Design an enzyme around this catalytic site. Structure first.
Site, short mmCIF file in Angstrom:
data_model
loop_
_atom_site.label_atom_id
_atom_site.label_comp_id
_atom_site.label_asym_id
_atom_site.label_seq_id
_atom_site.Cartn_x
_atom_site.Cartn_y
_atom_site.Cartn_z
N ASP A 10 -34.23 39.98 -8.32
CA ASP A 10 -34.61 40.28 -9.69
C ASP A 10 -35.54 41.49 -9.74
OD1 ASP A 10 -34.85 36.86 -11.06
OD2 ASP A 10 -33.18 37.98 -10.18
N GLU A 29 -28.22 28.63 -12.68
CA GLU A 29 -27.58 27.58 -11.89
C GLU A 29 -28.06 26.17 -12.28
OE1 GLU A 29 -29.17 29.33 -8.30
OE2 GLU A 29 -27.22 30.14 -7.74
N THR A 86 -22.22 29.82 -5.55
CA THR A 86 -22.86 31.12 -5.32
C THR A 86 -23.31 31.51 -3.90
OG1 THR A 86 -25.13 30.39 -5.82
CG2 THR A 86 -23.73 30.96 -7.68
N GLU A 97 -19.22 33.43 -5.47
CA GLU A 97 -19.89 34.73 -5.35
C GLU A 97 -20.63 34.78 -4.02
OE1 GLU A 97 -23.17 34.21 -8.15
OE2 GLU A 97 -21.73 34.32 -9.79
N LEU A 120 -26.06 37.12 -1.05
CA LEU A 120 -26.87 38.31 -0.82
C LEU A 120 -26.02 39.58 -0.73
CD1 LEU A 120 -29.26 36.91 1.93
CD2 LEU A 120 -29.74 37.14 -0.50
O1 LIG Z 1 -26.59 38.38 -12.77
C1 LIG Z 1 -26.29 37.10 -12.22
C2 LIG Z 1 -27.55 36.39 -11.73
O2 LIG Z 1 -28.00 37.09 -10.55
C3 LIG Z 1 -29.17 36.54 -9.93
O3 LIG Z 1 -28.95 35.25 -9.42
C4 LIG Z 1 -27.86 35.18 -8.47
C5 LIG Z 1 -28.38 35.16 -7.04
O4 LIG Z 1 -29.14 36.33 -6.79
C6 LIG Z 1 -27.21 35.08 -6.07
O5 LIG Z 1 -27.70 34.91 -4.75
C7 LIG Z 1 -26.27 33.91 -6.41
O6 LIG Z 1 -25.11 34.01 -5.65
O7 LIG Z 1 -25.89 33.94 -7.80
C8 LIG Z 1 -27.02 33.92 -8.70
C9 LIG Z 1 -26.47 33.81 -10.11
O8 LIG Z 1 -25.25 34.52 -10.24
C10 LIG Z 1 -30.34 36.54 -10.91
O9 LIG Z 1 -31.47 35.95 -10.31
C11 LIG Z 1 -29.95 35.76 -12.17
O10 LIG Z 1 -31.00 35.82 -13.12
C12 LIG Z 1 -28.66 36.34 -12.78
O11 LIG Z 1 -28.24 35.52 -13.86
O1 LIG Z 2 -35.47 34.66 -0.24
C1 LIG Z 2 -35.64 34.75 1.17
C2 LIG Z 2 -34.62 35.70 1.79
O2 LIG Z 2 -35.32 36.45 2.81
C3 LIG Z 2 -34.49 37.44 3.43
O3 LIG Z 2 -35.25 38.14 4.34
C4 LIG Z 2 -33.32 36.76 4.14
O4 LIG Z 2 -32.49 37.75 4.74
C5 LIG Z 2 -32.51 35.94 3.14
O5 LIG Z 2 -31.48 35.23 3.82
C6 LIG Z 2 -33.42 34.96 2.40
O6 LIG Z 2 -32.68 34.28 1.36
#
Ligand SMILES: OC[C@H]1O[C@H](O[C@H]2[C@H](O)[C@@H](O)[C@H](O)O[C@@H]2CO)[C@H](O)[C@@H](O)[C@@H]1O
Ligand SMILES: OC[C@H]1O[C@@H](O)[C@H](O)[C@@H](O)[C@@H]1O
Ligand SMILES: OC[C@H]1O[C@H](O)[C@H](O)[C@@H](O)[C@@H]1O
Length: 490
Positions: A96, A181, A337, A375, A378
């Protein structure tokens, strides 16, 4: 025909494409990026429709203008859209890079009633999402939280009717909690959590606490209290009384709490999905929700991180299939996700099993006969990541005789950025799209690959909680290939 093995690929738009001031900032810049996506063969894009931006001014003071301009551009670039009803805050989670709070007027109410926010045992209030405890409390200038979400979606439906009728919007994702989520905010970076901390239960606001005490009293144990030996955010399971071997989580008290805690999420999701079905009834779109992939501690008996997040999943209790069954009455899609990860990429001390978790969740969905999407968790640009996604998309490879016996409904890639468009990175991405499409050129008509969308029908009858929990019965997952037959290479 190979086209039957075709799995669509979507791309998430940048966070903040329309700023907190409700202004679509860089149309020209986005247009160029979007056109490159179109040339790469991408089927569509996903975007957050922030509640904190649209209903900022006050109750029912919606301003949809900036979002209409965005949808117009996406349509001009020949892409379809997955729209997220984002009722959460952007800012406190991984990735974010922009701050988008929930409506200020709701925050004003939270000033005189802090219990509308998720609260941990220490009393810290998280303001990124409204606790499930106030779902049906008429404390928001006459409305309940669920009514607020309901009115929001109806307004979206009516004000974007022309885009819905033209077939631009394909999926309607309904945010159900943190990061959109369906889960509790058990691992808040904003409060100091760090991977692979076990996280903390988030049921201490006055509404959830009152519900719990009433419930334990009806069970004949009014003396029962909320967990007081579960530890802190960054703890490890063995150093806590609740998650250790023969610990509290295995006692009658613990099992009652855990069932109660997880059941609240099932109902939260079921009731809001009901409102979503009513708001989009008749439209050619599908409903969907997002389930978080909590792979850390998945390899130990206590599955600590999963439990604190609200997924009551143990080796002898499937805490995900009942969510899939709940989604079936709504004919909704279950989006997981976190699909690109491999076990060997996690530190050994995290006890992670992302590969096994994916197989469990996807199998459960297909078992209940619902569509499953996903999805990457990372940002990844390498071939091994893309190849892992392609494997989970068609676990048993492509079929030359017809459709695959098993296949995901679609995959959304996170995220659109300048790094992705970098020459070498984009080069690999184009091969990824090609393989998802099973070596076939981009296909504009979803019907050709059995993805036609029919008018949304009213949800099926309410499934009682006892029937939902029947799905906690452990089942063997479907067979997975060791590697995909449609590799990107390297
Ligand atoms: O724009 C979609 C959302 O993206 C982020 O959350 C992701 C997260 O980073 C990702 O690892 C996971 O696979 O999906 C979620 C949601 O899609 C933001 O933190 C959210 O605020 C957004 O809605
Ligand atoms: O939010 C913590 C994140 O730290 C990163 O350094 C790691 O590579 C991610 O796997 C982990 O989710
Ligand atoms: O909740 C934010 C993210 O946390 C981590 C999970 O692996 C991912 O699936 C989720 O989206």
């Amino acid at each position: 025909n190979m086209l039957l093995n075709y799995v669509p690929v979507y791309v998430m738009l940048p966070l903040g494409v329309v700023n907190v001031d409700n202004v679509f900032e860089d149309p020209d810049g986005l247009k160029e990026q979007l056109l490159q996506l179109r040339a790469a063969g991408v089927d569509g894009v996903m975007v957050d429709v922030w509640w904190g931006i649209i209903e900022l001014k006050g109750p029912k003071q919606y301003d949809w203008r900036a979002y209409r301009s965005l949808l117009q551009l996406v349509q001009e670039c020949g892409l379809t859209l997955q729209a997220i009803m984002s009722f959460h805050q952007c800012g406190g989670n991984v990735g974010d890079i922009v701050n988008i709070p929930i409506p200020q007027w709701v925050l004003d109410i939270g000033e005189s009633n802090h219990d509308i926010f998720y609260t941990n045992r220490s009393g810290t209030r998280n303001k990124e999402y409204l606790t499930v405890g106030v779902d049906n409390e008429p404390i928001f200038h006459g409305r309940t939280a669920i009514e607020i979400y309901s009115d929001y979606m109806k307004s979206f439906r009516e004000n974007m009717s022309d885009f819905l009728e033209s077939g631009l919007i394909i999926d309607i994702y309904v945010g159900l909690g943190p990061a959109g989520e369906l889960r509790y905010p058990s691992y808040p970076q904003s409060q100091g959590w760090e991977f692979p901390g076990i996280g903390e239960f988030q049921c201490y606001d006055k509404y959830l606490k009152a519900d719990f005490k009433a419930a334990v009293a009806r069970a004949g144990h009014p003396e029962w209290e909320l967990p007081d030996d579960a530890g802190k955010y960054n703890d490890v399971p063995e150093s806590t009384g609740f998650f250790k071997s023969n610990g509290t989580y295995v006692t009658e008290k613990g099992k009652f709490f855990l069932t109660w805690y997880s059941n609240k999420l099932l109902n939260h999701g079921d009731q809001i999905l009901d409102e979503a079905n009513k708001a989009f009834l008749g439209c050619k779109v599908k409903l969907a929700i997002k389930v978080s992939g909590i792979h850390w501690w998945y390899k130990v008996e206590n599955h600590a991180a999963e439990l604190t997040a609200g997924y009551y999943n143990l080796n002898d209790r499937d805490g995900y299939r009942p969510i899939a069954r709940m989604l079936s009455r709504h004919h909704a899609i279950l989006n997981f996700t976190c699909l690109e990860m491999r076990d060997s990429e996690q530190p050994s001390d995290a006890k992670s099993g992302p590969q096994e978790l994916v197989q469990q969740v996807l199998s459960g969905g297909w078992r209940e006969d619902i569509r499953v999407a996903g999805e990457n968790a990372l940002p990844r640009y390498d071939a091994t990541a893309y190849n892992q996604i392609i494997l989970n998309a068609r676990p048993q490879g492509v079929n030359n005789n017809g459709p695959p016996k098993l296949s995901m409904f679609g995959v959304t890639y996170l995220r659109l950025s300048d790094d992705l468009l970098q020459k070498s990175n984009f080069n690999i991405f184009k091969k990824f799209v090609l393989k998802m499409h099973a070596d076939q050129d981009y296909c504009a008509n979803p019907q050709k690959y059995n993805h036609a969308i029919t008018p949304l029908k009213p949800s099926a009858p309410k499934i009682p909680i006892e029937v939902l929990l029947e799905a906690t019965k452990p089942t063997l997952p479907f067979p997975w290939l060791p590697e995909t037959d449609m590799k990107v290479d390297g």
